[PDB]
Protein backbone atom coordinates (compact mmCIF):
# COMPACT_ATOMS: atom_id res chain seq x y z
CA UNK A 1 0.00 0.00 0.00
CA UNK A 2 3.09 2.11 -0.12
CA UNK A 3 3.59 4.06 -3.35
CA UNK A 4 6.54 6.12 -4.54
CA UNK A 5 4.05 8.53 -6.18
CA UNK A 6 0.52 8.68 -4.76
CA UNK A 7 -1.99 9.53 -7.41
CA UNK A 8 -4.45 11.46 -5.45
CA UNK A 9 -4.22 15.22 -5.62
CA UNK A 10 -4.09 15.90 -1.85
CA UNK A 11 -3.60 19.20 0.02
CA UNK A 12 -0.22 18.58 1.61
CA UNK A 13 -0.84 21.38 4.15
CA UNK A 14 -3.44 19.22 5.78
CA UNK A 15 -1.73 15.90 6.04
CA UNK A 16 -0.35 14.72 9.37
CA UNK A 17 3.45 14.54 9.55
CA UNK A 18 3.14 10.74 9.60
CA UNK A 19 0.74 8.03 8.43
CA UNK A 20 -1.07 10.37 5.96
CA UNK A 21 -1.04 9.83 2.17
CA UNK A 22 2.59 9.26 1.02
CA UNK A 23 4.20 12.41 -0.38
CA UNK A 24 3.88 12.74 -4.16
CA UNK A 25 5.19 16.13 -5.20
CA UNK A 26 8.25 17.59 -3.58
CA UNK A 27 7.59 21.32 -3.42
CA UNK A 28 9.08 23.79 -0.94
CA UNK A 29 6.93 26.89 -1.55
CA UNK A 30 4.65 26.41 1.42
CA UNK A 31 5.00 24.29 4.58
CA UNK A 32 2.56 22.95 7.20
CA UNK A 33 5.58 23.33 9.53
CA UNK A 34 8.11 25.82 8.47
CA UNK A 35 10.59 24.59 11.05
CA UNK A 36 11.49 21.66 8.79
CA UNK A 37 12.23 23.95 5.83
CA UNK A 38 14.37 26.09 8.08
CA UNK A 39 16.36 23.10 9.25
CA UNK A 40 16.90 21.96 5.66
CA UNK A 41 18.26 25.44 4.77
CA UNK A 42 20.55 25.56 7.79
CA UNK A 43 21.86 22.10 7.26
CA UNK A 44 22.59 22.74 3.56
CA UNK A 45 24.26 26.00 4.61
CA UNK A 46 26.57 24.01 6.82
CA UNK A 47 27.71 21.57 4.14
CA UNK A 48 31.41 20.66 4.64
CA UNK A 49 33.73 18.01 3.40
CA UNK A 50 36.02 16.05 5.74
CA UNK A 51 38.89 15.58 3.35
CA UNK A 52 39.07 19.36 3.31
CA UNK A 53 40.08 19.11 6.97
CA UNK A 54 43.76 18.71 7.77
CA UNK A 55 44.41 15.99 10.30
CA UNK A 56 48.10 15.61 9.40
CA UNK A 57 49.37 16.37 12.92
CA UNK A 58 46.77 14.19 14.58
CA UNK A 59 48.98 11.22 13.53
CA UNK A 60 51.85 12.62 15.55
CA UNK A 61 49.66 13.46 18.60
CA UNK A 62 48.01 10.11 18.59
CA UNK A 63 51.33 8.25 18.35
CA UNK A 64 52.61 10.28 21.30
CA UNK A 65 49.50 9.31 23.28
CA UNK A 66 49.75 6.95 26.31
CA UNK A 67 48.09 3.66 25.41
CA UNK A 68 45.19 4.14 27.71
CA UNK A 69 44.68 7.49 26.09
CA UNK A 70 44.85 5.95 22.65
CA UNK A 71 42.35 3.35 23.84
CA UNK A 72 40.02 5.96 25.07
CA UNK A 73 40.24 8.04 21.88
CA UNK A 74 39.69 5.08 19.60
CA UNK A 75 36.91 3.47 21.61
CA UNK A 76 35.14 6.77 21.45
CA UNK A 77 35.62 7.04 17.76
CA UNK A 78 34.36 3.53 17.19
CA UNK A 79 31.16 4.44 19.06
CA UNK A 80 30.77 7.59 16.94
CA UNK A 81 31.20 5.38 13.80
CA UNK A 82 28.51 3.05 15.01
CA UNK A 83 26.00 5.76 15.75
CA UNK A 84 26.49 7.60 12.43
CA UNK A 85 26.56 4.22 10.59
CA UNK A 86 23.03 3.62 11.87
CA UNK A 87 21.81 7.16 11.63
CA UNK A 88 22.96 7.33 8.01
CA UNK A 89 20.51 4.60 6.88
CA UNK A 90 17.88 4.40 9.57
CA UNK A 91 15.92 7.61 9.24
CA UNK A 92 15.50 6.83 5.58
CA UNK A 93 14.56 3.23 5.92
CA UNK A 94 12.35 3.70 9.00
CA UNK A 95 10.78 7.10 8.44
CA UNK A 96 10.45 7.85 4.75
CA UNK A 97 7.78 5.23 4.16
CA UNK A 98 5.64 6.87 6.88
CA UNK A 99 6.01 10.55 6.13
CA UNK A 100 3.15 12.50 4.65
CA UNK A 101 4.39 16.09 4.34
CA UNK A 102 7.21 17.03 1.85
CA UNK A 103 9.17 19.37 4.12
CA UNK A 104 9.57 16.63 6.72
CA UNK A 105 10.31 14.10 4.01
CA UNK A 106 13.21 16.11 2.64
CA UNK A 107 14.44 17.07 6.10
CA UNK A 108 14.82 13.44 6.96
CA UNK A 109 16.69 12.79 3.75
CA UNK A 110 18.98 15.79 4.40
CA UNK A 111 19.47 14.78 8.01
CA UNK A 112 20.34 11.23 7.04
CA UNK A 113 22.65 12.43 4.30
CA UNK A 114 24.53 14.64 6.72
CA UNK A 115 25.16 11.57 8.91
CA UNK A 116 26.96 9.87 5.98
CA UNK A 117 29.33 12.83 5.79
CA UNK A 118 30.08 12.23 9.55
CA UNK A 119 30.76 8.61 8.74
CA UNK A 120 33.01 9.68 5.93
CA UNK A 121 34.87 11.95 8.33
CA UNK A 122 35.67 9.10 10.76
CA UNK A 123 37.08 7.16 7.89
CA UNK A 124 39.22 10.23 7.09
CA UNK A 125 40.37 10.49 10.66
CA UNK A 126 41.09 6.81 11.17
CA UNK A 127 43.00 6.26 8.02
CA UNK A 128 45.10 9.23 8.95
CA UNK A 129 46.11 8.01 12.32
CA UNK A 130 46.27 4.25 12.27
CA UNK A 131 48.07 1.87 10.00
CA UNK A 132 45.25 -0.43 9.04
CA UNK A 133 41.81 0.91 9.64
CA UNK A 134 40.31 -2.56 9.31
CA UNK A 135 41.36 -3.01 12.91
CA UNK A 136 39.29 -0.19 14.22
CA UNK A 137 36.40 -0.88 11.81
CA UNK A 138 36.40 -4.59 12.30
CA UNK A 139 36.26 -4.04 16.06
CA UNK A 140 32.94 -2.27 16.07
CA UNK A 141 30.43 -5.04 15.32
CA UNK A 142 31.93 -7.47 17.76
CA UNK A 143 33.01 -5.12 20.53
CA UNK A 144 30.70 -6.32 23.30
CA UNK A 145 31.23 -3.15 25.19
CA UNK A 146 30.25 -1.12 22.17
CA UNK A 147 27.28 -3.28 21.49
CA UNK A 148 26.45 -3.01 25.17
CA UNK A 149 26.58 0.85 25.10
CA UNK A 150 24.62 0.83 21.80
CA UNK A 151 22.17 -1.75 22.79
CA UNK A 152 18.56 -1.20 21.86
CA UNK A 153 19.05 1.30 19.00
CA UNK A 154 18.82 -1.05 16.09
CA UNK A 155 15.83 -2.62 17.96
CA UNK A 156 13.37 0.31 17.94
CA UNK A 157 14.12 0.82 14.29
CA UNK A 158 13.85 -2.78 13.21
CA UNK A 159 10.55 -3.33 14.98
CA UNK A 160 9.14 -0.09 13.62
CA UNK A 161 10.23 -1.31 10.16
CA UNK A 162 8.65 -4.74 10.58
CA UNK A 163 5.32 -3.42 11.70
CA UNK A 164 5.25 -0.74 9.00
CA UNK A 165 5.72 -3.46 6.39
CA UNK A 166 2.86 -5.50 7.72
CA UNK A 167 0.83 -2.37 7.83
CA UNK A 168 1.65 -1.61 4.19
CA UNK A 169 1.15 -5.19 3.08
CA UNK A 170 -1.97 -6.13 5.05
CA UNK A 171 -3.54 -2.91 6.31
CA UNK A 172 -5.03 -2.55 9.78
CA UNK A 173 -6.76 -5.54 11.35
CA UNK A 174 -6.14 -9.11 12.43
CA UNK A 175 -4.94 -11.40 9.81
CA UNK A 176 -3.92 -14.99 9.39
CA UNK A 177 -0.38 -15.46 8.09
CA UNK A 178 0.76 -19.07 7.66
CA UNK A 179 -1.79 -20.23 10.17
CA UNK A 180 -0.80 -17.51 12.76
CA UNK A 181 -2.84 -14.49 13.84
CA UNK A 182 -1.16 -11.20 13.18
CA UNK A 183 -2.66 -8.01 14.33
CA UNK A 184 -2.02 -4.74 12.61
CA UNK A 185 -3.17 -1.90 14.71
CA UNK A 186 -2.41 1.52 13.53
CA UNK A 187 -2.57 3.01 17.05
CA UNK A 188 0.16 0.59 17.94
CA UNK A 189 2.35 1.45 14.98
CA UNK A 190 1.97 5.11 15.98
CA UNK A 191 3.16 4.16 19.41
CA UNK A 192 6.22 2.33 17.96
CA UNK A 193 6.96 5.35 15.85
CA UNK A 194 6.58 7.71 18.85
CA UNK A 195 8.99 5.54 20.84
CA UNK A 196 11.56 5.20 18.05
CA UNK A 197 11.59 8.96 17.67
CA UNK A 198 12.12 9.52 21.35
CA UNK A 199 14.90 6.93 21.22
CA UNK A 200 16.45 8.74 18.29
CA UNK A 201 16.10 12.06 20.11
CA UNK A 202 18.10 10.49 22.93
CA UNK A 203 20.70 9.21 20.53
CA UNK A 204 21.05 12.60 18.83
CA UNK A 205 20.84 14.62 22.03
CA UNK A 206 22.73 12.59 24.57
CA UNK A 207 24.72 9.72 23.10
CA UNK A 208 26.65 11.97 20.77
CA UNK A 209 27.19 14.80 23.23
CA UNK A 210 28.76 12.40 25.60
CA UNK A 211 31.14 11.30 22.90
CA UNK A 212 31.93 14.93 22.10
CA UNK A 213 33.05 15.49 25.70
CA UNK A 214 35.76 12.88 25.34
CA UNK A 215 36.88 14.27 21.98
CA UNK A 216 37.10 17.73 23.35
CA UNK A 217 38.97 16.57 26.47
CA UNK A 218 42.01 15.95 24.17
CA UNK A 219 41.50 19.22 22.38
CA UNK A 220 41.66 21.20 25.63
CA UNK A 221 44.99 19.57 26.20
CA UNK A 222 45.98 20.72 22.71
CA UNK A 223 46.03 17.22 21.25
CA UNK A 224 44.24 15.83 18.15
CA UNK A 225 43.11 19.24 16.94
CA UNK A 226 42.15 17.91 13.49
CA UNK A 227 39.72 15.47 15.03
CA UNK A 228 38.48 18.25 17.14
CA UNK A 229 37.74 20.60 14.23
CA UNK A 230 35.82 17.75 12.61
CA UNK A 231 33.98 17.00 15.84
CA UNK A 232 32.99 20.61 16.11
CA UNK A 233 31.56 20.45 12.60
CA UNK A 234 29.77 17.18 13.41
CA UNK A 235 28.49 18.69 16.63
CA UNK A 236 27.10 21.67 14.77
CA UNK A 237 25.09 19.21 12.70
CA UNK A 238 23.80 16.95 15.45
CA UNK A 239 22.46 20.14 17.10
CA UNK A 240 20.26 20.62 14.09
CA UNK A 241 19.24 16.97 14.27
CA UNK A 242 18.11 17.18 17.83
CA UNK A 243 16.27 20.40 17.15
CA UNK A 244 14.38 18.42 14.55
CA UNK A 245 13.51 15.46 16.72
CA UNK A 246 12.44 17.69 19.67
CA UNK A 247 10.14 19.54 17.33
CA UNK A 248 8.64 16.43 15.89
CA UNK A 249 8.11 15.16 19.37
CA UNK A 250 6.71 18.35 20.70
CA UNK A 251 4.43 18.86 17.75
CA UNK A 252 3.11 15.34 18.03
CA UNK A 253 2.36 15.80 21.70
CA UNK A 254 0.76 19.18 21.33
CA UNK A 255 -2.05 17.39 19.65
CA UNK A 256 -1.88 20.03 16.86
CA UNK A 257 -1.01 17.34 14.26
CA UNK A 258 -2.56 13.90 14.71
CA UNK A 259 -4.72 14.08 17.85
CA UNK A 260 -4.47 10.40 18.43
CA UNK A 261 -0.68 10.96 18.66
CA UNK A 262 -1.02 13.30 21.57
CA UNK A 263 -3.08 10.77 23.53
CA UNK A 264 -0.41 8.24 22.66
CA UNK A 265 2.45 10.49 23.83
CA UNK A 266 0.47 10.61 27.02
CA UNK A 267 -0.05 6.90 27.42
CA UNK A 268 3.52 6.12 26.80
CA UNK A 269 5.18 8.79 28.91
CA UNK A 270 6.73 6.32 31.37
CA UNK A 271 8.16 4.35 28.52
CA UNK A 272 9.64 7.52 27.18
CA UNK A 273 11.10 8.27 30.58
CA UNK A 274 12.50 4.78 30.97
CA UNK A 275 14.41 4.72 27.70
CA UNK A 276 16.24 7.92 28.45
CA UNK A 277 17.09 6.56 31.85
CA UNK A 278 18.27 3.48 30.24
CA UNK A 279 20.29 5.41 27.70
CA UNK A 280 21.90 7.63 30.32
CA UNK A 281 22.77 4.50 32.32
CA UNK A 282 24.35 2.81 29.32
CA UNK A 283 26.61 5.81 28.83
CA UNK A 284 27.68 5.71 32.47
CA UNK A 285 28.54 2.04 32.15
CA UNK A 286 30.59 2.92 29.11
CA UNK A 287 32.79 5.00 31.41
CA UNK A 288 33.97 1.75 33.01
CA UNK A 289 35.13 0.32 29.67
CA UNK A 290 36.66 3.63 28.57
CA UNK A 291 38.72 3.87 31.75
CA UNK A 292 40.08 0.29 31.75
CA UNK A 293 43.87 0.92 31.62
CA UNK A 294 43.04 4.19 33.31
CA UNK A 295 41.67 7.70 32.93
CA UNK A 296 43.15 11.12 32.20
CA UNK A 297 43.99 14.15 34.29
CA UNK A 298 40.85 15.85 32.98
CA UNK A 299 38.40 13.04 32.59
CA UNK A 300 37.34 10.02 34.67
CA UNK A 301 34.12 8.00 35.14
CA UNK A 302 32.98 10.57 37.68
CA UNK A 303 33.02 13.76 35.59
CA UNK A 304 31.74 11.71 32.72
CA UNK A 305 28.86 10.44 34.83
CA UNK A 306 28.05 13.92 36.01
CA UNK A 307 28.06 15.42 32.57
CA UNK A 308 25.73 12.63 31.48
CA UNK A 309 23.13 13.35 34.20
CA UNK A 310 23.63 16.93 33.40
CA UNK A 311 22.83 16.72 29.75
CA UNK A 312 20.08 14.10 30.18
CA UNK A 313 18.20 16.40 32.43
CA UNK A 314 18.46 19.19 29.89
CA UNK A 315 17.13 17.04 27.05
CA UNK A 316 14.31 15.31 28.92
CA UNK A 317 13.01 18.63 29.96
CA UNK A 318 13.19 19.92 26.39
CA UNK A 319 10.70 17.24 25.54
CA UNK A 320 8.45 17.71 28.60
CA UNK A 321 9.66 14.64 30.61
CA UNK A 322 10.38 14.62 34.40
CA UNK A 323 14.07 14.91 35.42
CA UNK A 324 15.55 11.65 36.77
CA UNK A 325 18.72 13.20 38.16
CA UNK A 326 19.59 15.74 40.71
CA UNK A 327 19.88 19.20 39.25
CA UNK A 328 23.42 20.50 38.78
CA UNK A 329 25.53 22.94 36.88
CA UNK A 330 27.51 21.86 33.80
CA UNK A 331 30.30 19.69 35.16
CA UNK A 332 32.41 20.83 32.16
CA UNK A 333 31.54 24.26 30.79
CA UNK A 334 34.81 24.65 28.91
CA UNK A 335 33.07 22.20 26.54
CA UNK A 336 30.64 25.00 25.79
CA UNK A 337 33.56 26.69 24.02
CA UNK A 338 33.69 24.17 21.19
CA UNK A 339 29.99 23.35 21.43
CA UNK A 340 28.57 26.66 20.36
- The C-alpha angle with vertex 316 and arms to 156 and 235, in degrees rounded to 5, equals 80
Q: Which residues contact 321 (CB under 8 A, 6 or more apart)?
A: 269, 272, 273, 276
Instruction: Name the binder of 238 from Fe ion, its own copies, Hg ion, none, CB < 5-8 A by kind.
Output: Fe ion
Q: 3-state class of 132 per DSSP?
A: coil
**Residue 124 among known ligand-binding residues:** no
Alpha-carbon span 232 to 244, nearest angstrom: 19
Residues found near Hg ion in the complex (CB under 5 A): 72, 156-157, 196, 199-200, 213-214, 217, 265, 268-269, 271-272, 296, 304
Instruction: Name the phi and psi angles at 134, rounded to 5.
Output: -50, -25
Q: Left if phi > 0, otherwise alpha if psi is -120 to 50, otherwise beta: which for 214? A: alpha
Tally of CB atoms within 10 A around 105: 20
Q: Would you say the C-alpha torsion 298, 299, 304, 306 has a positive or negative sign?
A: negative
Q: Which of 33, 122, 194, 310 is catalytic?
A: 122
Give Cα separations from 320 to 90, 181, 246, 270 (angstroms).
25, 37, 10, 12
Residues found near Fe ion in the complex (CB under 5 A): 84, 115, 118, 204, 238, 241
The nearer residue to Fe ion, 65 or 108, going by C-beta atoms, is 108
Instruction: Name the binder of 199 from Fe ion, its own copies, Hg ion, none, CB < 5-8 A by kind.
Output: Hg ion
| Size of interface with its own copies, in residues (CB under 8 A) | 74
Site for its own copies contains 141 (CB under 8 A): yes
Min separation Cβ 249 and Fe ion, Å: 15
Element (H, E) at 29: none
**Residue 84 among known ligand-binding residues:** yes
- Per the annotation, the verdict on 122 as an active-site residue is yes
| Identified binder of its own copies from the candidate list 46, 68, 147, 262, rule CB under 8 A | 147
Total residues belonging to the chain: 340
Query: Alpha carbon 297 to chain centroid distance?
Result: 29
Alpha-carbon span 90 to 81, nearest angstrom: 14
Instruction: Name the binder of 214 from Hg ion, its own copies, Fe ion, none, CB < 5-8 A by kind.
Output: Hg ion
**Residue 188 among known ligand-binding residues:** no
Chain residues 172-211 in contact with its own copies, contact rule CB under 8 A = 175-179
The nearer residue to Hg ion, 150 or 265, going by C-beta atoms, is 265
The nearer residue to its own copies, 87 or 246, going by C-beta atoms, is 87
Min separation Cβ 212 and Fe ion, Å: 11
Site for its own copies contains 24 (CB under 8 A): yes
**Residue 322 among known ligand-binding residues:** no
Binding positions are 84, 115, 118, 204, 238, 241
Active site members: 122
Amino acid sequence: AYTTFSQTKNDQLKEPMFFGQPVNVARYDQQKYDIFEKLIEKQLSFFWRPEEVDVSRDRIDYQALPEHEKHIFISNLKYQTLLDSIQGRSPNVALLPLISIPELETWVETWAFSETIHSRSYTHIIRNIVNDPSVVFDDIVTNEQIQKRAEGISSYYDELIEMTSYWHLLGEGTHTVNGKTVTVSLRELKKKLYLCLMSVNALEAIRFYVSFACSFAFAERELMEGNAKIIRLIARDEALHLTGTQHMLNLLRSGADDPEMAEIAEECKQECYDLFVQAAQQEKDWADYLFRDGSMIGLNKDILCQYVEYITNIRMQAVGLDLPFQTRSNPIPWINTWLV
